[PDB]
Coordinates of C-alpha atoms in Angstrom, one line a residue:
Chain A
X783 CA 0.0 0.0 0.0
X784 CA 1.9 3.1 -1.2
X785 CA 1.6 6.8 -0.2
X786 CA 1.7 10.1 -2.1
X787 CA 2.4 12.8 0.6
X788 CA 1.5 16.5 0.1
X789 CA 3.8 19.2 1.4
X790 CA 0.8 21.3 2.0
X791 CA -2.6 22.6 0.5
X792 CA -2.3 26.4 0.2
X793 CA -5.2 26.8 -2.1
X794 CA -8.8 25.3 -2.0
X795 CA -9.1 22.5 -4.4
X796 CA -11.0 19.3 -5.2
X797 CA -8.5 16.5 -5.3
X798 CA -9.3 13.3 -7.2
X799 CA -7.5 9.9 -6.8
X800 CA -8.7 7.5 -9.5
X801 CA -12.6 7.5 -9.4
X802 CA -12.6 9.1 -5.8
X803 CA -12.6 12.9 -4.9
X804 CA -12.7 15.1 -1.8
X805 CA -12.7 18.8 -1.2
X806 CA -9.7 20.4 0.5
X807 CA -10.0 23.9 2.1
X808 CA -7.3 26.8 1.8
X809 CA -4.4 25.9 4.3
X810 CA -6.4 22.7 5.5
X811 CA -3.8 20.5 7.2
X812 CA -4.0 17.8 4.4
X813 CA -0.7 15.9 3.8
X814 CA -1.6 13.2 1.2
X815 CA -3.1 9.9 0.2
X816 CA -2.1 6.6 1.8
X817 CA -3.1 2.8 1.2
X818 CA -2.9 3.2 -2.7
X819 CA -3.2 -0.3 -4.3
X820 CA 0.0 -1.6 -5.8
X821 CA -0.2 -3.2 -9.2
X822 CA -2.2 -0.6 -11.2
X823 CA -1.5 2.9 -12.7
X824 CA -3.2 5.7 -10.7
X825 CA -4.1 9.3 -11.5
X826 CA -4.2 12.2 -9.0
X827 CA -6.1 15.2 -10.3
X828 CA -7.0 18.7 -9.3
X829 CA -9.7 21.3 -9.9
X830 CA -9.1 24.6 -8.1
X831 CA -12.2 26.1 -6.3
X832 CA -11.4 29.6 -7.6
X833 CA -11.0 28.5 -11.4
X834 CA -12.3 25.3 -13.0
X835 CA -10.2 26.0 -16.1
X836 CA -7.3 24.6 -13.9
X837 CA -8.3 20.9 -14.3
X838 CA -5.2 18.7 -14.5
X839 CA -3.3 15.8 -13.0
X840 CA -0.6 13.1 -12.9
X841 CA -0.5 9.5 -14.1
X842 CA 1.9 7.4 -12.0
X843 CA 2.8 3.9 -10.7
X844 CA 4.3 3.8 -7.1
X845 CA 6.4 0.7 -8.1
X846 CA 8.5 3.1 -10.2
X847 CA 9.5 5.6 -7.4
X848 CA 8.6 7.7 -4.4
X849 CA 6.2 10.6 -5.6
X850 CA 4.8 13.6 -3.7
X851 CA 2.7 16.7 -4.5
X852 CA 3.9 20.3 -3.7
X853 CA 2.0 23.4 -4.5
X854 CA 4.1 25.9 -6.8
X855 CA 2.9 29.5 -6.1
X856 CA 4.7 30.7 -9.2
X857 CA 3.2 28.3 -11.7
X858 CA 0.0 28.2 -9.6
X859 CA -0.5 24.5 -9.5
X860 CA -0.1 21.3 -7.5
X861 CA 3.0 19.6 -9.0
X862 CA 4.1 15.9 -8.7
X863 CA 7.8 15.4 -7.9
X864 CA 10.0 12.3 -7.2
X865 CA 11.9 12.0 -3.9
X866 CA 15.2 10.2 -4.7
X867 CA 16.1 9.9 -0.9
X868 CA 14.2 6.8 0.2
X869 CA 14.9 7.4 4.0
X870 CA 13.8 11.1 3.9
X871 CA 10.6 9.9 2.1
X872 CA 9.9 7.0 4.5
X873 CA 10.4 9.5 7.4
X874 CA 8.0 12.2 5.9
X875 CA 5.3 9.5 5.2
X876 CA 5.7 7.9 8.8
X877 CA 5.3 11.4 10.5
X878 CA 2.2 12.4 8.5
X879 CA 0.6 8.9 9.1
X880 CA 1.3 9.2 12.8
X881 CA -0.4 12.6 12.9
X882 CA -3.3 11.1 10.7
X883 CA -3.1 14.0 8.2
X884 CA -3.7 11.6 5.3
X885 CA -6.8 10.4 3.5
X886 CA -7.1 6.7 2.8
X887 CA -7.6 5.3 -0.7
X888 CA -11.2 4.3 -0.1
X889 CA -11.4 1.0 -2.0
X890 CA -14.3 -1.4 -1.2
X891 CA -12.9 -4.9 -1.2
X892 CA -15.4 -6.4 -3.6
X893 CA -15.0 -3.5 -6.0
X894 CA -13.0 -4.2 -9.2
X895 CA -13.9 -0.9 -10.9
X896 CA -10.4 0.5 -11.0
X897 CA -8.8 -2.7 -12.2
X898 CA -11.6 -3.0 -14.8
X899 CA -10.9 0.5 -16.2
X900 CA -7.1 0.1 -16.2
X901 CA -6.7 -3.6 -17.0
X902 CA -4.5 -2.9 -20.1
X903 CA -3.1 0.5 -19.1
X904 CA 0.7 0.4 -18.6
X905 CA 2.8 3.4 -17.4
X906 CA 5.5 2.6 -20.1
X907 CA 2.7 3.2 -22.7
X908 CA 1.4 6.4 -21.0
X909 CA 5.0 7.8 -21.2
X910 CA 5.1 7.4 -25.0
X911 CA 1.7 9.1 -25.5
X912 CA 2.7 11.8 -23.0
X913 CA 6.4 12.8 -23.7
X914 CA 8.4 14.2 -20.7
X915 CA 11.2 11.7 -20.3
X916 CA 12.9 13.4 -17.2
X917 CA 9.8 12.4 -15.1
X918 CA 8.5 8.9 -14.3
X919 CA 4.9 10.3 -14.0
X920 CA 2.8 12.0 -16.7
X921 CA 0.9 15.4 -16.6
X922 CA -2.4 15.7 -18.5
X923 CA -5.0 18.5 -18.6
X924 CA -8.3 19.7 -20.0
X925 CA -6.7 21.8 -22.9
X926 CA -3.9 19.4 -24.2
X927 CA -4.5 18.7 -27.9
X928 CA -3.7 15.5 -29.8
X929 CA -1.1 15.0 -32.6
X930 CA -4.2 14.4 -34.9
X931 CA -6.0 17.6 -33.7
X932 CA -2.7 19.6 -34.3
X933 CA -2.4 18.3 -38.0
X934 CA -6.0 19.7 -38.9
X935 CA 0.4 23.9 -32.2
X936 CA 3.1 23.1 -29.4
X937 CA 4.4 19.6 -30.1
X938 CA 6.1 19.2 -26.6
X939 CA 2.7 19.4 -24.7
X940 CA 0.6 17.1 -27.1
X941 CA -1.1 13.8 -26.6
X942 CA 0.7 11.3 -29.0
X943 CA -2.3 9.0 -29.5
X944 CA -2.0 6.6 -32.6
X945 CA -3.5 8.5 -35.5
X946 CA -6.7 6.7 -36.8
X947 CA -8.2 8.3 -40.1
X948 CA -10.8 6.1 -41.9
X949 CA -10.2 8.3 -45.2
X950 CA -6.4 7.9 -45.4
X951 CA -4.1 5.8 -47.6
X952 CA -3.0 4.1 -44.3
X953 CA -6.7 2.9 -43.9
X954 CA -7.3 2.0 -47.6
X955 CA -5.4 -0.4 -49.9
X956 CA -5.2 0.8 -53.5
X957 CA -7.7 -1.4 -55.5
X958 CA -9.7 -2.4 -52.3
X959 CA -11.3 1.1 -51.8
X960 CA -15.0 0.0 -51.2
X961 CA -14.0 -3.2 -49.5
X962 CA -11.6 -1.5 -46.9
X963 CA -14.0 1.5 -46.4
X964 CA -17.1 -0.7 -45.7
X965 CA -15.1 -3.4 -43.7
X966 CA -12.2 -2.0 -41.8
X967 CA -10.7 -5.5 -40.8
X968 CA -7.5 -5.0 -42.8
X969 CA -6.9 -1.6 -41.2
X970 CA -7.7 -3.1 -37.6
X971 CA -5.9 -6.4 -38.0
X972 CA -2.8 -5.8 -40.3
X973 CA -2.1 -2.0 -40.0
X974 CA -3.1 -1.4 -36.4
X975 CA -2.8 -4.7 -34.4
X976 CA 0.1 -6.5 -36.2
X977 CA 1.7 -3.3 -37.6
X978 CA 1.6 -0.5 -34.9
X979 CA 0.2 -1.8 -31.5
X980 CA 1.8 -5.3 -32.0
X981 CA -1.1 -6.9 -29.9
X982 CA -4.7 -6.3 -28.6
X983 CA -3.5 -5.5 -25.0
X984 CA -1.6 -2.4 -26.2
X985 CA -4.7 -1.3 -28.4
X986 CA -7.0 -1.7 -25.3
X987 CA -4.5 0.1 -23.1
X988 CA -4.5 3.2 -25.4
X989 CA -8.4 3.0 -25.6
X990 CA -8.7 2.8 -21.8
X991 CA -6.2 5.7 -21.3
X992 CA -8.1 7.8 -23.9
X993 CA -11.5 7.2 -22.0
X994 CA -10.0 8.1 -18.6
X995 CA -8.4 11.4 -19.9
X996 CA -11.8 12.3 -21.4
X997 CA -13.6 11.4 -18.2
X998 CA -11.2 13.0 -15.6
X999 CA -10.1 16.1 -17.5
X1000 CA -12.9 16.5 -20.1
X1001 CA -10.1 16.3 -22.7
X1002 CA -11.9 16.5 -26.0
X1003 CA -9.2 15.0 -28.2
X1004 CA -9.0 12.0 -25.9
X1005 CA -12.8 11.5 -26.3
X1006 CA -12.3 11.6 -30.1
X1007 CA -9.5 8.9 -29.8
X1008 CA -11.7 6.7 -27.5
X1009 CA -14.6 6.8 -30.0
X1010 CA -12.3 6.2 -33.1
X1011 CA -10.8 3.0 -31.5
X1012 CA -14.3 1.7 -30.7
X1013 CA -15.5 2.5 -34.1
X1014 CA -12.6 0.8 -35.8
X1015 CA -13.3 -2.5 -34.1
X1016 CA -17.2 -2.2 -34.5
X1017 CA -16.7 -1.4 -38.3
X1018 CA -14.5 -4.6 -38.8
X1019 CA -16.4 -7.8 -40.0
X1020 CA -13.4 -10.0 -38.8
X1021 CA -12.3 -9.5 -35.1
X1022 CA -11.0 -12.3 -32.9
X1023 CA -13.7 -13.6 -30.5
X1024 CA -11.5 -12.8 -27.4
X1025 CA -11.1 -9.2 -28.5
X1026 CA -14.9 -8.7 -28.9
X1027 CA -15.6 -10.5 -25.5
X1028 CA -12.9 -8.2 -23.9
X1029 CA -14.2 -5.0 -25.6
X1030 CA -17.8 -5.6 -24.2
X1031 CA -16.3 -5.8 -20.7
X1032 CA -14.1 -2.7 -21.2
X1033 CA -17.0 -0.5 -22.5
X1034 CA -19.5 -1.8 -19.8
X1035 CA -17.2 -0.6 -17.0
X1036 CA -16.6 2.8 -18.8
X1037 CA -20.3 3.4 -19.3
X1038 CA -21.0 2.2 -15.8
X1039 CA -18.4 4.7 -14.4
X1040 CA -19.3 7.8 -16.4
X1041 CA -21.2 10.5 -14.4
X1042 CA -24.9 10.3 -15.4
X1043 CA -24.9 14.2 -16.2
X1044 CA -21.8 14.1 -18.6
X1045 CA -23.4 11.6 -21.1
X1046 CA -24.4 14.6 -23.3
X1047 CA -20.8 15.9 -23.9
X1048 CA -18.7 12.6 -23.5
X1049 CA -20.8 10.2 -25.7
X1050 CA -21.0 10.6 -29.5
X1051 CA -24.5 9.7 -30.7
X1052 CA -23.4 8.6 -34.2
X1053 CA -20.7 6.3 -33.0
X1054 CA -22.7 4.5 -30.3
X1055 CA -25.8 4.2 -32.6
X1056 CA -23.7 2.8 -35.4
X1057 CA -21.7 0.5 -33.0
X1058 CA -24.7 -1.0 -31.1
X1059 CA -27.4 -1.1 -33.9
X1060 CA -25.8 -1.0 -37.6
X1061 CA -22.2 -2.3 -37.4
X1062 CA -20.8 -5.8 -38.0
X1063 CA -20.4 -6.1 -34.2
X1064 CA -24.1 -4.8 -33.4
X1065 CA -24.8 -8.2 -31.7
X1066 CA -21.3 -8.8 -30.0
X1067 CA -21.6 -6.2 -27.2
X1068 CA -24.5 -7.6 -25.1
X1069 CA -23.3 -6.1 -21.7
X1070 CA -22.5 -2.7 -23.2
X1071 CA -25.8 -2.6 -25.2
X1072 CA -27.9 -3.4 -22.0
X1073 CA -26.1 -0.8 -19.7
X1074 CA -26.4 1.8 -22.5
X1075 CA -30.1 1.1 -23.1
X1076 CA -30.9 1.2 -19.3
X1077 CA -28.6 4.2 -18.4
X1078 CA -28.7 6.4 -21.6
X1079 CA -31.8 5.6 -23.7
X1080 CA -32.1 9.3 -24.8
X1081 CA -28.7 9.3 -26.6
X1082 CA -29.9 6.2 -28.6
Chain B
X651 CA -18.0 23.8 -49.4
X652 CA -21.4 23.2 -51.2
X653 CA -21.9 24.7 -54.6
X654 CA -25.2 26.8 -54.5
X655 CA -27.1 29.9 -55.9
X656 CA -24.5 32.2 -54.2
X657 CA -21.4 30.8 -55.8
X658 CA -22.7 29.7 -59.3
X659 CA -20.4 32.0 -61.3
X660 CA -17.4 29.9 -60.0
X661 CA -18.6 27.2 -62.6
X662 CA -17.3 29.5 -65.5
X663 CA -14.0 30.7 -64.2
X664 CA -10.6 29.3 -65.5
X665 CA -10.1 26.6 -62.7
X666 CA -10.8 23.2 -64.4
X667 CA -13.8 21.4 -62.7
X668 CA -16.0 18.6 -63.5
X669 CA -19.6 17.8 -62.5
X670 CA -20.2 14.0 -61.9
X671 CA -23.8 12.6 -62.0
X672 CA -24.3 9.0 -61.1
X673 CA -28.1 8.8 -61.5
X674 CA -27.9 6.8 -64.8
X675 CA -25.1 4.4 -63.7
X676 CA -27.4 1.5 -62.4
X677 CA -30.6 1.2 -64.4
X678 CA -33.2 -1.6 -64.2
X679 CA -36.6 -2.6 -65.5
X680 CA -38.8 -4.2 -62.7
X681 CA -40.9 -7.2 -63.8
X682 CA -42.9 -10.2 -62.6
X683 CA -41.5 -13.7 -62.5
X684 CA -43.4 -16.9 -63.6
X685 CA -44.1 -17.6 -59.9
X686 CA -45.5 -14.0 -59.5
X687 CA -42.5 -12.6 -57.5
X688 CA -40.7 -9.4 -58.7
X689 CA -37.2 -9.3 -60.3
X690 CA -35.0 -6.5 -61.9
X691 CA -33.2 -6.7 -65.1
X692 CA -30.3 -4.3 -65.5
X693 CA -29.8 -2.2 -68.8
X694 CA -26.7 -0.4 -69.8
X695 CA -26.0 2.9 -67.8
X696 CA -23.5 5.7 -68.0
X697 CA -21.6 8.2 -65.8
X698 CA -22.3 11.8 -66.8
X699 CA -19.0 13.7 -66.2
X700 CA -19.2 17.3 -67.6
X701 CA -16.8 20.3 -67.8
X702 CA -19.3 23.1 -67.5
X703 CA -16.9 25.7 -68.9
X704 CA -15.9 23.9 -72.1
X705 CA -19.0 21.5 -72.6
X706 CA -16.6 18.5 -72.8
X707 CA -18.6 15.4 -71.7
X708 CA -16.9 12.2 -70.7
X709 CA -19.7 9.7 -71.0
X710 CA -18.5 6.4 -69.4
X711 CA -20.8 3.6 -70.6
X712 CA -21.6 1.1 -67.7
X713 CA -22.3 -2.3 -69.4
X714 CA -24.6 -4.7 -67.6
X715 CA -21.7 -7.2 -67.3
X716 CA -20.2 -5.0 -64.5
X717 CA -23.1 -6.1 -62.2
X718 CA -22.8 -9.9 -62.9
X719 CA -22.6 -11.8 -59.6
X720 CA -22.4 -8.7 -57.5
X721 CA -24.6 -7.9 -54.3
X722 CA -26.0 -4.5 -53.2
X723 CA -25.8 -3.0 -56.7
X724 CA -27.1 0.5 -55.7
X725 CA -24.2 0.7 -53.2
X726 CA -21.7 -0.8 -55.7
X727 CA -22.9 1.7 -58.4
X728 CA -21.5 4.6 -56.3
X729 CA -18.1 2.9 -55.8
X730 CA -17.9 1.9 -59.6
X731 CA -18.7 5.6 -60.4
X732 CA -16.0 6.8 -58.1
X733 CA -13.5 4.1 -59.5
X734 CA -14.2 5.3 -63.1
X735 CA -13.9 9.0 -62.3
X736 CA -10.5 8.4 -60.5
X737 CA -9.4 6.3 -63.6
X738 CA -10.5 9.2 -65.9
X739 CA -8.5 11.8 -63.7
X740 CA -5.4 9.6 -63.8
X741 CA -5.7 9.2 -67.6
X742 CA -5.6 13.0 -68.2
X743 CA -2.3 15.0 -68.4
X744 CA -1.6 16.9 -65.2
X745 CA -2.5 20.3 -66.7
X746 CA -6.0 18.9 -67.7
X747 CA -6.8 17.3 -64.3
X748 CA -9.7 19.1 -62.5
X749 CA -9.0 21.3 -59.4
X750 CA -12.5 20.4 -58.1
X751 CA -15.1 17.7 -58.8
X752 CA -18.8 18.5 -57.9
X753 CA -21.1 15.5 -57.3
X754 CA -24.7 16.0 -58.0
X755 CA -25.7 13.5 -55.1
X756 CA -24.2 13.7 -51.6
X757 CA -24.0 9.9 -51.5
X758 CA -21.1 10.1 -54.0
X759 CA -18.9 12.1 -51.6
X760 CA -17.3 9.4 -49.5
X761 CA -16.8 6.9 -52.4
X762 CA -15.1 9.7 -54.6
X763 CA -13.0 11.0 -51.6
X764 CA -11.7 7.5 -51.0
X765 CA -10.9 6.7 -54.7
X766 CA -9.2 10.2 -55.0
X767 CA -6.9 9.8 -51.9
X768 CA -3.8 10.0 -54.4
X769 CA -5.1 13.6 -55.4
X770 CA -5.3 15.5 -52.0
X771 CA -5.4 18.9 -53.8
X772 CA -8.6 18.0 -55.9
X773 CA -11.5 19.3 -53.9
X774 CA -14.6 17.0 -53.8
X775 CA -17.8 19.2 -53.4
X776 CA -21.4 18.6 -53.0
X777 CA -24.1 21.0 -54.5
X778 CA -27.4 22.5 -53.2
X779 CA -28.3 22.9 -56.9
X780 CA -31.0 20.4 -58.1
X781 CA -29.5 19.8 -61.6
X782 CA -31.4 17.9 -64.3
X783 CA -28.5 15.6 -65.5
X784 CA -30.7 12.5 -64.9
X785 CA -32.4 13.6 -68.2
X786 CA -29.1 13.0 -70.2
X787 CA -30.6 9.7 -71.4
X788 CA -33.4 11.9 -73.1
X789 CA -30.7 13.1 -75.6
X790 CA -31.3 10.6 -78.5
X791 CA -27.6 10.2 -79.5
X792 CA -26.4 9.7 -75.8
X793 CA -29.3 7.1 -75.2
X794 CA -28.3 5.3 -78.5
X795 CA -24.6 4.9 -77.8
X796 CA -25.4 3.6 -74.2
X797 CA -28.0 1.0 -75.3
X798 CA -25.8 -0.3 -78.3
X799 CA -22.7 -0.8 -76.1
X800 CA -21.6 -4.5 -75.9
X801 CA -18.7 -3.7 -73.6
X802 CA -17.4 -1.0 -71.3
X803 CA -16.6 2.2 -73.4
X804 CA -15.8 5.9 -72.9
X805 CA -17.4 8.2 -75.5
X806 CA -16.4 11.9 -75.7
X807 CA -19.0 14.7 -76.8
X808 CA -19.3 18.4 -76.5
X809 CA -22.8 18.9 -74.9
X810 CA -22.9 22.5 -76.1
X811 CA -22.3 21.7 -79.8
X812 CA -20.8 24.9 -81.4
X813 CA -22.8 27.3 -79.0
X814 CA -19.5 28.7 -77.4
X815 CA -18.7 30.3 -80.9
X816 CA -21.7 32.7 -80.2
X817 CA -22.4 32.7 -76.4
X818 CA -20.6 32.5 -73.1
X819 CA -20.3 29.3 -70.9
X820 CA -22.7 30.9 -68.4
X821 CA -25.4 31.2 -71.1
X822 CA -24.6 27.7 -72.6
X823 CA -25.0 26.0 -69.1
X824 CA -28.3 27.9 -68.6
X825 CA -29.5 26.7 -72.1
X826 CA -28.4 23.1 -71.3
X827 CA -30.1 23.0 -67.8
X828 CA -33.3 24.5 -69.3
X829 CA -33.4 21.9 -72.1
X830 CA -32.7 19.0 -69.6
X831 CA -35.2 20.4 -67.0
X832 CA -37.9 20.4 -69.8
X833 CA -36.9 16.9 -71.0
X834 CA -37.1 15.7 -67.3
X835 CA -40.6 17.3 -66.6
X836 CA -42.3 16.3 -69.9
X837 CA -40.0 14.4 -72.3
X838 CA -42.7 14.0 -75.1
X839 CA -43.5 17.7 -75.1
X840 CA -39.9 18.8 -74.9
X841 CA -38.8 16.4 -77.9
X842 CA -41.8 17.8 -79.9
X843 CA -40.7 21.4 -79.3
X844 CA -37.1 20.6 -80.5
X845 CA -38.0 18.5 -83.6
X846 CA -41.3 20.1 -84.9
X847 CA -39.7 22.2 -87.7
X848 CA -38.2 19.5 -90.0
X849 CA -36.1 22.2 -91.9
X850 CA -33.9 22.6 -88.6
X851 CA -31.7 19.4 -88.4
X852 CA -29.1 18.0 -86.0
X853 CA -25.6 18.0 -87.6
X854 CA -24.0 14.5 -87.6
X855 CA -21.3 15.8 -85.2
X856 CA -23.9 17.5 -82.9
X857 CA -26.5 16.5 -80.2
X858 CA -29.1 19.4 -80.6
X859 CA -30.7 21.1 -83.6
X860 CA -28.9 23.9 -85.6
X861 CA -31.1 26.8 -84.3
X862 CA -30.2 30.5 -85.4
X863 CA -29.9 32.9 -82.3
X864 CA -33.6 34.0 -83.0
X865 CA -34.9 30.4 -83.1
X866 CA -33.0 29.5 -79.8
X867 CA -35.0 32.4 -78.1
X868 CA -38.3 31.0 -79.4
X869 CA -37.2 27.5 -78.3
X870 CA -36.1 28.6 -74.9
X871 CA -39.5 30.4 -74.4
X872 CA -41.4 27.2 -75.4
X873 CA -39.3 25.2 -72.8
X874 CA -40.0 27.6 -70.0
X875 CA -43.8 27.6 -70.9
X876 CA -43.7 23.8 -70.8
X877 CA -41.9 23.7 -67.3
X878 CA -44.5 26.2 -65.8
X879 CA -47.6 24.5 -67.4
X880 CA -46.4 21.1 -66.0
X881 CA -45.8 22.8 -62.6
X882 CA -49.5 23.9 -62.7
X883 CA -50.7 20.7 -64.6
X884 CA -49.0 19.1 -61.5
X885 CA -49.3 21.0 -58.2
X886 CA -53.0 22.5 -58.4
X887 CA -51.3 26.0 -58.3

């Protein structure tokens, strides 16, 4: 059970850790989050009480180092940092725990939600989508644009998601125009799975990471990437049975976790209607179709 | 963006463009079977690809053999149209390739965009104009070459005959669309107006009769009257 200590909380802020969140008051004696489950990536995220544009956070894995949060009054944000001195860090965490100035990661024992949302998500893949090689953790916010969005302005602060474009030479073999446009199996299986991702686990990892960035930061380009990766599977007549079965589970937990009131801005009507009702895979997502029909029958 | 009533004049500027109409590519007769079910029989079709500035018509004849053993023909017809237009562009010297292709039907946009990926600088545009190019098969010489085809064939015509010697592209396109609109609304009445003075013939190398400037004015009047009549014969207005 790892710990991310906080130096202090000088400004009033809503702090998220994965799917949980709590309000911290200006100068409240809050010194961090303990009992964080080992074995998964985590995200710690912030929304300032004084300015909801400031919506941002850090992907990390406590197996990779000792991380803490410290407010920077110059840059005006809570920053993640690595403590290289193991003993100094153990001594900080021990003191704060003794004084019970830390919130406990509030996992219900029966509750597999976070595993289910991050099953394929790996910190080494995050660090390739979010490039800042001097850190072992990854900063994301509401406003960061994707490489794809930037093609259609600062490359150092971009989300390097795999570019998917249904009307590209990459997606369409010369002489198989109609076939490849109407059945994307070659694009899914040869170009993306065999070619670029190497396997379904890395493809699902990127899909799950895109969802989480869309949900936690309202990152619009992430939402575009999540929908494109769903649509590419649903628009393929030939998908391995294990991928369809896994996709149904992945989407079920994403739709289950989405705040009821954000369905209007986070769910694309065209993609979902096409994926559940028109596509090759219209009958392969039973769990997802049932939760969508019961939770969001308006969108459909 | 969309070609409309606001940006019409762009059709007659010096940027090469083609209109593509796919409404006569897939053509059937519907009939009863012996068992009293319904079946279709395909007949020869054509792509209508037209330079509205020069009048150059690229009439690609679609022979019924194209359809043999294929499913979802109305969908395939859009893709075959896009394949043949992209083959026509590749066949033209670079300085003759269009800068824009305007499709008369929005369902052609994705098929043509996907076949033209090799040509990123050629703009594929829809139109808000309701153009009467479906009536191309009411022009006897175009109908004749399509129906007589025994194999895939491209035939080249100038749909304006020699009109550009005397009038602008703007006016020629206006004459063409009025003739085709009349032929679309009441073919029998339109053909009678065009071929009622036996002294005015169609040259061997032409599609339309050899009207003097004055006779074209009378003809154009008769076509407008036919279109309004049929609109009142129709609508109870």
